[PDB]
């Protein structure tokens, strides 16, 4: 999934 | 004249009852504090001079001592958090905000600079500057038909100070403050000065570093096409924040990610993924990994732009931290991709460089790679070509690496490797 | 960040 920072 | 004064002489002059003597001593303090080598900030603070400087900010009849005290305090506030706190503790925030409307441009600019240092300390001083009402007078200095009529240095300082008001998390800036600043910020993001552009990009990168609601506030203002343009600039100080902002935006929704793709961002990644600056390459691969975590039609755009060969390259040779982001981009790709998209990955040569990275000591990349290998086998099961894949992996030495990983001390690692061995290599 | 003047 999307990985912030 | 006012060069190389001692602190004790500065104190004597400021404690005099004589404004011109006070002005001369304040200049002497400014010059001390503006020396490159070990300016005696702490000595000036211990001498108790901050409350005097702050009082001088209010001397409307003596604009020189306003300027000199503002500059002195700016340089104190440029130091440690404790030194910045001493400036704030002296009442400097409301004093500086009142100076933003000064008819003397060099005094207003110094006040802008000082507030940037104070806000830049951290979220608490940032929000305290906002609570004291700094935003309205700051934005009024930029409410002109054409930014090009402002002095370049002035405009750069205003942009940098607004960027500090956008900076830092826990908490992020107040939502109403961001909404108040954004229209001016988008105007600065279209300016032609490289330094204004760099700092405007940094501000946008801060505002997009957070929950998807924060990203939406920015994207809604239509800045993505300008960001993609700046992504192709020649100035590395522009590319770096532009890429960070684009990267943050694609951590959001598939719809927010689609605006980056629609704006043409993918056409820039052939260069970004080969950029000689290791940090640009790493951040570009991290950005790609969040794009390949998207929808199948978005993966398909990655393919159409010819970027899978570039991911194979980074996996083959790059700084290890960049290679780690590439493994993530591949696993995300294989997780959400069609069978045909996953097959194409193998035709582009992903297996050998992916296998060679299983020799890495980092435990997390090994789990990521093994999960990608599983997803690729699963796509091959649906075509009945698992054997041909197993042969690729054996010929390049991957089977030896997966077998050795059954002895790995980490639990999930030696678990996944065994499953592949028994399921496809038996 | 923070910047000193001269």
Other Cβ atoms less than 10 A from the Cβ of B320: the count is: 12
- Backbone phi, then psi, for B287, in 5-degree steps? -55, -45
Q: Verify B-A touch: 3 or more CB pairs within 8 A.
A: yes
Residues of A contacting chain B (CB within 8 angstroms): 1-5
Cα dihedral B227, B233, B235, B238 in deg (nearest 10): 0
* Residue with tokens 């400097």, as numbered in its chain: B92
CB contact under 8 A, A1 and B293: yes
Contact between B87 and B73 under an 8 Å Cβ cutoff? The reply is yes
Distance of alpha carbon B19 from alpha carbon B17, whole angstroms: 7
* A3–B290 CB contact, under 8 Å: yes
- Rounded to whole angstroms, the Cα distance separating B133 from B176 reads 13
Instruction: List the single best residue of B170, B290, B324, B368 to mutate versus A (max A Cβ within 10 A).
Output: B290
- Pick the residue of B251, B330, B333, B364 with the most A CBs within 10 A to test the interface with A by mutation: B251
Asked if B74 is an interface residue toward chain C (Cβ–Cβ < 8 A), one would say yes
Q: Does B77 touch chain C (CB under 8 A)?
A: yes
CB contact under 8 A, B113 and C6: no
User: DSSP class of residue B103?
Assistant: S
Cα distances from B198 to residues A5, B88, B141, B243, B329, in angstroms, run 20, 28, 20, 11, 27
Distance CA B340, CA B296 (A): 11
When CB atoms are compared, the residue of B71, B79, B160 closest to C5 is: B71
> Structure solved using which method?
X-ray
- Which residue of chain B is at minimal alpha-carbon distance from C3? B78
Taking a C-beta distance cutoff of 8 angstroms, is the pair B218, B207 a contact? yes
**Distance (Å) from the C-alpha of residue A4 to the closest C-alpha of chain B?**
6
- Other CB atoms within a 10 A radius of the CB of residue B268 amount to 19
Closest chain C C-alpha to B75 CA, distance in angstroms = 5
Whether B209 contacts chain A with CB within 8 A: yes
| C1 Cα to chain B: minimum distance (Å) | 5
d(CA B340, CA B337): 8
**Which residue of chain C is at minimal alpha-carbon distance from B79?**
C2
Domain extent for B160? 1-426
Instruction: Report the residue of chain C nearest B74, measured CA to CA.
Output: C4
- Other Cβ atoms less than 10 A from the Cβ of B169: the count is 12
* Angstroms from B36 CA to nearest CA on chain C: 7
> B303: which residues sit within 8 A by CB, 6+ positions away?
B341, B344
Taking Cα atoms as reference points, which of A4, A3, C4, C1 lies closest to residue B121? Answer: C1
- Please say whether the beta carbons of B329 and B292 come within 8 A: yes
- Evaluate whether B226 touches B242 at the Cβ level (below 8 Å): no
Q: Which two tokens stand for residue B397?
A: 């030495």
The pair of structure tokens assigned to B287 is 């950005």
Measured in angstroms, the resolution is 2.1
Measured CA to CA, the distance from residue B88 to residue B93 in angstroms comes to: 6
Q: How many residues does chain A have?
A: 5
Residue B338 vs residues B213, B244, B263, B335: alpha-carbon distances, Å = 30, 29, 24, 9
Q: Do B78 and C1 touch (CB under 8 A)?
A: no
CA distances from B419 to B64, B126, B392, B414, B415 (A): 77, 53, 18, 9, 6
Query: Closest chain B residue to A1 measured between Cα atoms?
Result: B293
Contact B160 C5 (CB under 8 A): no
What does the angle CA B352 – CA B356 – CA B361 come to, to the nearest 5 degrees? Answer: 160
Q: How many CB pairs under 8 A join B and C?
A: 29
When divided into structural domains, chain B yields a total of 1
Contact B328 A3 (CB under 8 A): yes
Which SS3 state, helix, strand or coil, does residue B233 take?
coil
CB contact under 8 A, C2 and B34: no
Q: Look at A2 and B293 and tell me if their CB atoms are within 8 Å.
A: yes
């Amino acid at each position: 999934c999307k990985r912030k920072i | 004249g006012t060069v190389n004064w001692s602190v004790e002489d500065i104190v004597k002059g400021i404690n005099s009852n004589n404004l011109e003597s006070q002005l001369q001593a304040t200049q002497a303090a400014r010059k001390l504090l503006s020396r490159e080598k070990q300016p005696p900030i702490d000595n000036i603070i211990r001498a108790g001079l901050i409350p005097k400087f702050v009082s001088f900010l209010g001397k409307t009849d003596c604009s020189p001592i306003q300027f000199e005290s503002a500059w002195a305090l700016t340089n104190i506030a440029s130091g440690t958090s404790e030194q910045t706190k001493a400036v704030v503790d002296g009442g400097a925030i409301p004093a500086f905000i009142s100076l933003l409307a000064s008819p003397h441009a060099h005094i207003s600019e110094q006040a802008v600079w000082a507030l940037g240092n104070i806000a830049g300390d951290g979220s608490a001083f940032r929000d305290l500057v906002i609570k004291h009402g700094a935003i309205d007078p700051l934005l009024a200095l930029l409410a002109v038909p054409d930014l090009s009529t402002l002095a370049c240095g002035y405009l750069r300082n205003l942009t940098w100070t607004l960027s500090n008001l956008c900076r830092n998390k826990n908490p992020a800036p107040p939502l109403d403050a961001v909404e108040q600043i954004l229209p001016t910020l988008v105007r600065l993001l279209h300016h032609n000065d490289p330094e204004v552009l760099a700092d405007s990009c940094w501000a946008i990168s801060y505002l997009t570093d957070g929950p998807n609601e924060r990203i939406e506030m920015v994207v809604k203002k239509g800045v993505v096409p300008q960001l993609v343009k700046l992504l192709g600039a020649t100035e590395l100080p522009i590319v770096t924040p532009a890429l960070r902002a684009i990267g943050n935006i694609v951590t959001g929704t598939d719809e927010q990610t689609q605006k980056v793709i629609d704006a043409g961002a993918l056409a820039v990644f052939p260069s970004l993924l080969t950029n000689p600056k290791t940090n640009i390459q790493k951040e570009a691969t991290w950005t790609m990994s969040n794009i390949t975590a998207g929808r199948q039609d978005q993966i398909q755009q990655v393919v159409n732009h010819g970027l899978v060969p570039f991911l194979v390259g980074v996996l083959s040779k790059a700084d290890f931290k960049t290679q780690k982001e590439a493994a993530w981009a591949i696993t995300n790709y294989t997780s959400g991709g069609t069978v045909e998209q996953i097959v194409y990955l193998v035709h582009c040569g992903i297996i050998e460089p992916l296998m060679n990275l299983l020799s890495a000591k980092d435990t997390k990349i090994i789990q990521v790679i093994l999960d990608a290998i599983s997803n690729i086998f699963q796509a091959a099961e649906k075509l009945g070509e698992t054997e041909k894949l197993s042969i690729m992996i054996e010929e390049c030495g991957g089977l030896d690496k997966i077998e050795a990983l059954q002895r790995h001390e980490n639990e999930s690692v030696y678990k996944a490797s065994l499953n592949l061995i028994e399921k496809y290599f038996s | 960040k923070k910047l000193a003047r001269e």
